[PDB]
Design a protein around this ligand. Structure first.
Ligand code: CLA
Ligand code: CLA
Ligand code: CLA
Ligand code: CLA
Ligand code: PHO
Ligand code: PL9
Ligand code: LMG
Ligand code: LMG
Ligand code: BCR
Ligand code: BCR
Ligand code: BCR
Ligand code: OEX
Ligand code: CL
Ligand code: CL
Ligand code: FE2
Ligand code: NA
Lengths: 38, 48, 30, 30, 36, 67, 27, 484, 48, 76, 31, 31, 63, 348, 31
């Protein structure tokens, strides 16, 4: 539209979603490490 | 028991998808749909 | 060498569990 | 040449058109 | 329009259903599929 | 505010100038359906050939076809 | 040369051979 | 604010940034293609294209480089076996460097389209608000796609201008890149005929020109425009994703069942060749022929090329590996050194015993020897107790024809058992196991990994198609329902 | 108390035993039986 | 409207269906008792599983000749 | 009458009663 | 696979952890 | 396809659990339940019959 | 439509006839859903009652034989047929319905018509959610059962030797298929399968615990000990105490839900992700890409008799399953394994 | 040192870059 970009958006990640992401990634590690090491 | 856990997944997806199907508009496409729900609010958040 | 990795991953998941229990965002009534 | 496999397949395509025509009859005859 | 009670109809159809299931459990001990 | 005037942009402007304009009613949807159903028949032909539920005289449908 | 000795030679090794899958009407 | 799974939606209504991200993704993909060609050339060993072929090395992108014509290398070798005298500019490393350069150019173009997103080209003049003429743009792209398909099918693969494609024999013996004439008949739909590829691409390209012209001229109808929501970029996203997993099923099934566009010399043998005894048929047929005219079983087994016996080995199946058995087949069972020879097992009294070959489903299979007529005669027994089929009392002796061991006969039960256990896996081989520190367990082919990746990606893209079509049909109720 | 036992449930008029899906389950069950606790057994019937 | 409360409690419904329900039951009985099920659905009769030729489970072992092979292997 | 409800309930009831008679018939088939 | 598995596991921990911690620190910095 | 009635209310054909079988100059009562097998355990077996689950229970003659 | 004239046509008349309140919503998708679903269900009920399995597998799978509910099945066709579509007009049957039934064509009928009935049902979910103007999360949820169905009954037999190795439609046949995946594939050890198990058991946990929490944190609205009569259809207040529920689970479990929308999205998310992971794992198994072995533990157990683990016990049990089930389950291989060579422990 | 050196270099690239990206994204979020 103008010289600046009109679609300027902010991203959000609450501490709860941080906790789901960390559990998810670490659980994928616990699950899959035995198989990657094989 | 197998029917119980298969129906548990059935009805969990069913009820979650019906509640998520009938969510009421408070937010925009910018904000996640959960941001339309406020903790401790009196009004019901979906159309039963 | 592998038991080190498994032990680290397990205590990492437990640490994230501890932080999620006792260090959550406090819900507000409003 | 028209293999009998081809012949059965073409009559099956005819039959599918017949089923669609009957479905049209069901939707127009309420 | 309702000249036979709905509960009476339901009890009779339940009786036929139970008698049918009893026949099905009986026939597993005799004839085909009866391990004998 | 008008955007950035460009030589190649003004070149490709007419190809993307008439956005959102249509023909009334149905148009060529019947001929589209003929295209759909002929494609379905052709695609089912080659599916049955590779599944060999349809036999043709010249089609070996096996590795000896590479001979 | 003959198609019967090949059939009897490949019967003991693998039984899903395509020649055991074709033209065994009379077998 | 925006959730993490929604951030890329910032380029929905900005065509400049959309072209920028398409360009950047194109740069990443081309840079990967070049980087992987370089990695595979670095881990490639072309010293043995008969017993250490390229599909035994875990090479993924070099089969696709070779399938279209790139067979020469700047390294002084050609994978077909010859010595690269004049490879030219288009070697394996040549295509790799070209992909890296193209990725750099596309990164520069993505930077430019990120900065200069406000192009007046993206503005509809009638209202001044940004838009896309999606039917017309689709028509243009279909015109270009059809023209490119026709050019590739009439010029490259036919050999009038390009090099053709990789064509081999049915049994995968020699193999080379040659031009293939188009097949316009019913034979052109034979999926193993290489003549289908030029004829198909010519016809599909011509039809692409015709459909692109129709789409450049004819506008969509109003009620179809509102039914399919043709003015929305997410609708075309969903329809394209549908076409993409459709093509993913098609290429995955093509790779798995085998076709002329999946040659075994590049992608490995299929599961069904071992299941249906294809190479085994050829081996004992080339034995029966030329045994029928003298030169008995002591000889003419060396007439069997070492390629057919190598293709007749369960370790070359793509359905015999594991999901976490990572890497090359050589890293699994060792590098094949040489064919030890066809082992013929015989009883004490005169009957010949054949080893029951291993079916694909089994990871462990018991060792049995059966006669011609189909009666079990000997075995390597698990119990060995109150038993009368064991080797030490049946009296089985093993002989060799046409391999590393020629004419040798072994009667010691231990070596008889080990040769029977190896003949269980098909033709017996020596493997140098010390070169890659091979563990011993079987692997999957590039064909097998290709099918797995594309089928899993295909189901994930089926869900993506459903979700995106859902978003297009239900765009107005995304934040919730209308309350009234 | 165990699950249902449907082995040799169907027989023909001449008394031959037809295999059944329950009999395929029985075959897999035997494979699961004999291999489990391979050295712990000294006697045929596994009453213990 | 007939909300399923006056239609299953109606003698008009019950008289007409006192013949169709057990006529259907008798027809299903005769379909099994007269062997028409054996004939149309391909299931062999309890006394016709093994013939004089074979004494084991039949095997199809062919695809395009499967029709006449299962013809020759079945009980006619 | 002959409604959509009629046809949809008949398609699932008429073969059902026919089949129930069928199973009840074979339930007394001896060997 | 004993060192390659180790570096794969370390990568798969650190990289998504880095991504999510970008987003969380960004979010919490806005009060 | 031959049109014949089924078996109901007419008593059972065989109940004694045994079936006769005639071979090369020998007649015996085979187990009606046992399945025949084609594996010639010995090079001189005329008929071999074994139980459906286990091949432990097997009966065969030699000639 | 949209302030235009748009004179009516046969499409609009048919659309208005289809999209209206009836006893059963038919819709456009019902042109597919109703016949395909009726034929799949009726074909299964027909095969479980009359259609034999004596020629495709050498088994018994119909009520006319003597099988009950748990044991009857519509059996997959013979391995010889491979992945043939088993059309009744095709080469194997040649138009003849009777010998089509006994050659295994009914499995292909039930599978193809069941797939198209599933497509028709998801299109029905899309259509009904559009007509009532609701978000299509019910169809997004149903995406996972179709993913499981296609990966199990279509992708896996297409990857293996043929439809014979697909699950036959029937309870004991499904159990055979399950024990087959145990013995041949070690599907218990597969990370994608155990993700599916975690998803299904977690979805059952969420279902049970949301039900109990809601049913135990109600508001009064009473003057009656039957709580079920304290609910009215159209109002604007919460029926159970969200804050009390959050407090209870915060003090019992440590963490608790405080967003109703995220709670129900989690109840939606858990079974869908579980079933999708199971689908991906079955697609891996379609190409025999098993998580059968741990290379390090297997080489350690080969180089040490004293190393014994539950995983090695499972490997031995799987060898037992394969070798004791192959001869009777796979007639096409003609596997006449003698009693001699079968694996066997001491006694038993 | 051929794969240990690779994982050492990989972690040296990732951990300080990730820390710096945390801080920079945190800053640029707040204007
Ligand atoms: C050509 C394919 C394609 C394209 C162009 C898009 C594009 C889009 N999708 Mg979609 N999607 C696709 C396929 C595709 N999708 C598939 C296959 C699935 C099934 C898994 C989905 C499921 C899906 C969902 C559930 C959602 C979207 C959403 C969106 C929108 C925002 C995406 C976003 O911000 O996430 C950002 C992603 C990240 C921040 C990180 C993701 C990291 C991934 C998970 C792992 C790393 C992948 C790896 C590096 C690359 C290999 C992938 C490749 C081989 C396929 C966007 C327009 C969102 C939407 O609807 O908008 C409102 C949304 O809710 N998609
Ligand atoms: C269509 C995609 C595709 C396919 C089919 C293949 C196929 C193949 N690749 Mg390849 N690769 C790809 C993409 C692909 N690749 C990409 C995009 C890259 C760039 C990153 C690479 C980089 C690469 C390298 C460097 C190498 C290969 C190699 C190989 C060959 C060995 C088999 C294998 O991959 O190990 C097994 C595969 C797996 C175990 C994958 C696991 C299955 C899923 C994805 C589980 C992961 C999910 C889970 C969240 C992960 C958590 C684990 C964590 C705890 C560590 C094989 C033919 C090797 C080779 O042979 O050299 C020539 C080799 O060294 N590839
Ligand atoms: C002029 C540009 C150009 C050229 C000459 C090449 C050339 C080559 N590329 Mg390449 N590539 C390019 C651009 C180019 N690329 C770009 C821009 C990208 C980024 C997206 C890539 C990414 C890429 C990758 C990832 C790979 C290659 C590979 C290759 C090599 C083999 C191609 C192959 O075997 O696959 C065959 C190509 C196809 C099968 C294309 C199929 C087309 C489908 C069917 C389109 C159908 C949809 C369409 C709309 C249908 C229209 C309908 C019709 C009626 C009109 C070859 C040397 C491969 C390789 O071996 O590495 C070196 C490899 O894996 N390229
Ligand atoms: C929602 C309706 C529907 C759908 C989607 C299907 C779908 C299917 N059915 Mg089915 N069926 C239906 C209704 C339906 N059926 C009904 C109502 C009956 C009872 C009459 C049957 C009875 C039935 C049987 C007995 C069988 C199937 C089978 C099949 C499968 C393959 C059929 C096929 O490929 O033929 C192809 C059909 C078409 C391609 C239709 C398109 C016709 C084209 C567009 C027109 C061409 C014809 C035209 C006259 C050509 C001449 C024109 C000339 C003048 C130029 C398939 C998945 C087979 C199966 O189960 O597989 C094992 C099979 O055995 N069906
Ligand atoms: C064994 C498990 C299982 C069964 C039996 C099942 C069944 C059903 N779920 C449905 C719905 C759903 N499934 C859902 C989530 C889930 N469903 C799950 C697991 C199951 N879901 C799981 C695990 C989840 C969690 C993701 C959702 C979200 C929905 C719905 O919206 C819907 C509903 O409202 O539930 C009431 C219904 C759709 C049926 C229909 O008319 O389709 C029409 C198509 C038909 C009938 C043709 C299909 C025929 C099939 C494919 C082949 C034939 C099968 C034979 C008839 C029977 C074979 C039985 C043997 C194998 C033993 C049906 C009641
Ligand atoms: C020495 C050591 C440490 C030993 C341990 C070793 C060991 C055994 C390791 C294994 C552990 C490990 C992590 C393995 C599991 C791996 C595994 C299979 C992972 C699968 C991963 C994966 C991505 C799967 C995808 C499927 C998926 C989404 C699963 C998620 C499962 C999951 C989180 C389900 C929910 C479970 C659960 C407890 C929910 C309770 C929710 C809750 C409290 C609601 C209650 C509630 C209800 C209400 O109604 C209201 C109103 C309120 C308010 C309220 O609160
Ligand atoms: C009302 C509508 C029902 C829709 C049909 C579904 C069931 C049809 C088959 C039942 C049948 O005929 O069995 C028929 C069998 C017949 O019984 C058997 O018949 C043979 C005849 O030779 C032999 O005699 C056997 O020995 C004998 O047991 O009945 C049984 O097996 C007894 C139990 C049957 C009860 C069914 C319970 C199933 C419960 C729920 C259904 C599952 C899921 C529903 C939701 C999804
Ligand atoms: C962390 C995230 C990645 C986890 C996997 C790490 C593998 C470890 C490893 O050994 O890698 C290394 C392996 C090979 O590693 C080694 O290679 C050597 C030769 O170079 C030898 O052969 C060795 O035997 C081998 O172990 O190669 C890879 O890089 C794996 C590539 C991964 C892609 C495989 C296909 C995936 C297809 C689809 C994926 C998604 C599908 C949809 C969803 C499901
Ligand atoms: C600038 C420039 C330049 C340069 C360029 C370059 C150098 C480029 C490149 C590049 C590159 C070198 C690239 C690469 C890449 C890669 C990629 C892009 C990747 C990937 C991958 C993926 C995505 C994966 C994933 C996964 C995993 C992780 C595992 C398994 C599973 C999956 C598949 C998921 C030049 C001078 C020319 C010119 C000027 C400009
Ligand atoms: C073959 C075929 C077809 C189709 C057909 C159909 C689709 C039909 C049907 C059908 C059906 C549809 C059937 C049915 C049946 C049913 C039944 C048989 C039922 C049942 C139930 C029971 C028996 C039980 C009951 C009960 C009781 C009583 C108690 C409690 C409850 C319960 C429920 C459990 C045709 C010809 C087209 C052609 C092609 C092929
Ligand atoms: C649940 C239900 C129902 C129902 C059903 C049914 C069907 C029922 C029944 C029932 C019954 C079916 C009853 C009966 C009864 C009776 C009784 C309970 C009695 C008695 C008595 C006594 C105690 C006796 C005595 C004696 C002796 C001791 C000896 C001889 C003489 C005499 C006989 C006197 C319905 C559907 C409606 C609805 C829903 C729910
Ligand atoms: O631990 Mn496990 O498996 Ca119940 O049975 Mn007695 O214990 Mn022993 O044997 Mn059998
Ligand atoms: Cl155990
Ligand atoms: Cl004991
Ligand atoms: Fe609720
Ligand atoms: Na024992």
């Amino acid at each position: 539209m103008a010289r600046p970009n009109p679609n300027k958006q902010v991203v959000e990640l609450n501490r709860s979603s941080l906790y789901w992401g960390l559990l998810l990634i670490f659980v994928l590690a616990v699950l899959f490490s035995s198989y990657i090491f094989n | 028991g197998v029917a119980g856990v298969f129906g548990g997944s059935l009805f969990s997806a069913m009820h979650g998808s019906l509640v998520t199907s009938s969510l009421i508009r408070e937010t925009t496409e910018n904000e996640s749909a959960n941001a339309g729900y406020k903790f401790g609010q009196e009004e019901e958040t979906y159309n039963i | 060498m592998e038991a080190l990795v498994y032990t680290f991953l397990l205590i990492g998941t437990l640490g994230i569990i501890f932080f999620s229990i006792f260090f959550r965002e406090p819900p507000r009534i409003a | 040449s028209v293999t009998p496999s081809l012949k059965n397949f073409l009559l099956s395509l005819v039959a599918g058109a017949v089923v669609l025509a009957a479905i049209a009859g069901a939707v127009t005859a309420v | 329009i309702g000249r036979i009670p709905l509960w009476l109809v339901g009890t009779v159809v339940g009786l036929l259903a139970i008698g049918l299931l009893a026949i099905f459990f009986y026939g597993s001990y005799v004839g085909l599929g009866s391990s004998l | 505010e008008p955007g950035i005037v460009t030589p190649l942009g003004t070149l490709l402007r007419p190809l993307n100038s008439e956005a959102g304009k249509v023909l009334p009613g149905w148009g060529t949807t019947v001929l589209m359906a003929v295209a759909i159903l002929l494609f379905a028949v052709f695609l089912l032909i080659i599916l049955e050939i590779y599944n060999s539920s349809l036999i043709l005289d010249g089609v070996t449908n096996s590795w000896e076809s590479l001979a | 040369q003959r198609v019967r000795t090949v059939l009897d030679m490949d019967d003991p090794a693998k039984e899903e051979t395509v020649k055991e899958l074709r033209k065994d009407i009379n077998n | 604010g925006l959730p993490w799974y929604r951030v890329h939606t910032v380029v929905i209504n900005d065509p400049g940034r959309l072209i920028s991200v398409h360009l950047m993704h194109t740069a990443l993909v081309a840079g990967w293609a070049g980087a992987m060609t370089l990695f595979e050339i670095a881990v490639f060993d072309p010293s043995d294209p008969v017993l250490n072929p390229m599909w035994r090395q875990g090479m993924f992108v070099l089969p696709f480089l070779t399938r279209l014509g790139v067979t020469q290398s700047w390294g002084g070798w050609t994978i077909s076996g010859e010595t690269s005298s004049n490879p030219g500019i288009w070697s394996y490393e040549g295509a790799a460097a070209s992909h890296i350069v193209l990725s750099g150019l596309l990164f520069l173009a993505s930077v430019w389209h990120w900065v200069y997103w406000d192009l007046e080209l993206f503005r509809d003049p009638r209202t001044g608000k940004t838009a896309l003429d999606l039917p017309k743009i689709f028509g243009i792209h279909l015109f270009l796609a059809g023209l490119l398909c026709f050019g590739f099918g009439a010029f490259h693969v036919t050999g009038v201008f390009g090099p053709g494609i990789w064509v081999s024999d049915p049994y995968g013996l020699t193999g080379s890149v040659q031009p293939v004439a188009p097949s316009w008949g019913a034979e052109g739909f034979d999926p193993y005929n290489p003549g289908g590829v030029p004829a198909h691409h010519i016809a599909a390209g011509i039809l692409g020109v015709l459909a692109g012209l129709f789409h450049l001229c004819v506008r969509p109808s109003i009620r179809l425009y509102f039914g399919l929501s043709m003015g929305s970029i997410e609708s075309v996203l969903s329809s394209s994703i549908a076409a993409v997993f459709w093509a993913a099923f098609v290429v995955a099934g093509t790779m798995w069942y085998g076709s002329a566009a999946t040659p075994i010399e590049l992608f490995g043998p299929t599961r069904y060749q071992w299941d249906q005894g294809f190479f085994q048929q050829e081996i004992q047929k080339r034995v029966a022929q030329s045994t029928s005219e003298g030169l008995s079983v002591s000889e003419a087994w060396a007439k069997i090329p070492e390629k057919l016996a190598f293709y007749d080995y369960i370790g070359n199946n793509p359905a015999k590996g594991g999901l976490f058995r990572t890497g090359a087949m050589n890293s699994g069972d060792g590098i094949a050194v040489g064919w030890l020879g066809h082992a013929s097992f015989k009883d004490q009294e005169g009957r010949e015993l054949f080893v029951r070959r291993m079916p694909t489903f089994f990871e462990t299979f018991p060792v049995v020897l059966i006669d011609k007529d189909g009666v079990v005669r000997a075995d390597v027994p698990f119990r060995k107790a109150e038993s009368k089929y064991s080797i030490e009392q049946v009296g089985v002796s093993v002989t060799f024809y046409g391999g590393e061991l020629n004419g040798l006969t072994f009667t010691d039960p231990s070596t008889v058992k080990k040769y029977a256990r190896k003949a269980q896996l098909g033709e017996i081989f020596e493997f140098d196991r010390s070169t890659l520190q091979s563990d011993g367990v079987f692997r999957s082919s590039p064909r097998g990994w290709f099918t797995f990746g594309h089928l899993s990606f295909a189901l994930l893209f089926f869900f993506g198609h459903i979700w995106h079509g859902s978003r297009t049909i239900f765009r107005d109720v995304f934040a919730g329902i209308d309350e009234d | 108390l165990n699950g249902f036992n449907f082995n040799q449930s169907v027989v023909d008029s001449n008394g031959r035993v037809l295999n059944t899906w329950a009999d395929i389950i029985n075959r897999a069950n035997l494979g699961m039986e004999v291999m489990h606790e391979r050295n712990a057994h000294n006697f045929p019937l596994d009453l213990a | 409207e007939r909300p399923f409360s006056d239609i299953l409690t109606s003698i008009r419904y019950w008289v007409i269906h006192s013949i169709t329900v057990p006529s259907l039951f008798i027809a299903g009985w005769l379909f099994v008792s007269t062997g028409l099920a054996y004939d149309v659905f391909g299931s062999p009769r309890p006394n016709e599983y093994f013939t004089e030729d074979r004494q084991d489970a039949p095997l199809i072992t062919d695809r395009f000749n499967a029709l006449e092979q299962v013809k020759k292997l079945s009980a006619q | 009458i002959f409604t959509v409800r009629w046809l949809a309930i008949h398609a699932i009831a008429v073969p059902t009663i026919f089949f129930l008679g069928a199973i009840t018939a074979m339930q007394f088939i001896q060997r | 696979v004993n060192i390659l598995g180790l570096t794969a596991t370390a990568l798969f921990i650190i990289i998504p952890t880095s991504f999510l911690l970008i987003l969380y620190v960004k979010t919490a910095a806005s009060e | 396809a031959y049109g014949e009635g089924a078996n109901v209310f007419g008593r059972v054909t065989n109940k004694s659990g045994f079936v006769p079988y005639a071979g090369d100059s020998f007649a015996l009562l085979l187990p009606s339940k046992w399945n025949p097998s084609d594996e010639k355990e010995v090079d001189s077996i005329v008929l071999r019959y074994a139980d459906n689950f286990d091949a432990v229970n097997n009966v065969y003659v030699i000639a | 439509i949209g302030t235009y004239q748009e004179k009516r046509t046969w499409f609009d008349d048919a659309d208005d006839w289809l999209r209206q309140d009836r006893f059963v919503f038919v819709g456009w998708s019902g042109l597919l859903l109703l016949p395909c679903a009726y034929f799949a269900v009726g074909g299964w009920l027909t095969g479980c009652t009359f259609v034999t399995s004596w020629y495709t597998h050498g088994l018994a799978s119909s009520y006319i034989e003597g099988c009950n509910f748990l044991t009857a099945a519509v059996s997959t066709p013979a391995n010889s047929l491979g992945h043939s579509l088993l059309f009744v007009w095709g080469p194997e049957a040649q138009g003849d319905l009777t010998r089509w039934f006994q050659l295994g064509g009914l499995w292909a009928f039930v599978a193809l018509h069941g797939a198209f009935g599933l497509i028709g049902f998801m299109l029905r979910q899309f259509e009904i959610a559009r007509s009532v103007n609701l978000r299509p999360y019910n169809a997004i949820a149903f995406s996972a059962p179709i993913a499981v169905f296609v990966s199990v009954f279509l992708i896996y037999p297409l990857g293996q030797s043929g439809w014979f190795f697909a699950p036959s439609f029937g309870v004991a046949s499904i159990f055979r298929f399950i024990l087959f995946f145990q013995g041949f594939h070690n599907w218990t050890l597969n990370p994608f399968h155990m993700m599916g198990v975690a998803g299904v058991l977690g979805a059952a946990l969420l279902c049970a615990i949301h039900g109990a929490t809601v049913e135990n944190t109600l508001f009064e609205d009473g003057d009656g000990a039957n709580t079920f009569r304290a609910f009215n259809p159209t109002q604007a207040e919460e029926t159970y105490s969200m804050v009390t529920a959050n407090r209870f689970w915060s003090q019992i479990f440590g963490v608790a839900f405080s967003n109703k929308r995220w709670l129900h999205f989690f109840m939606l998310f858990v079974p869908v992700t579980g079933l999708w992971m199971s689908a991906l794992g079955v697609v891996g198994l379609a190409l025999n890409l098993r998580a059968y072995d741990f290379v390090s533990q297997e080489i350690r157990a080969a180089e040490d008799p004293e190393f014994e683990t539950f995983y090695t016990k499972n490997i031995l049990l799987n060898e037992g399953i394969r070798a004791w089930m192959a001869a009777q389950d796979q007639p096409h291989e003609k596997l006449t394994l003698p009693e001699e060579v079968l694996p066997r422990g001491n006694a038993l």
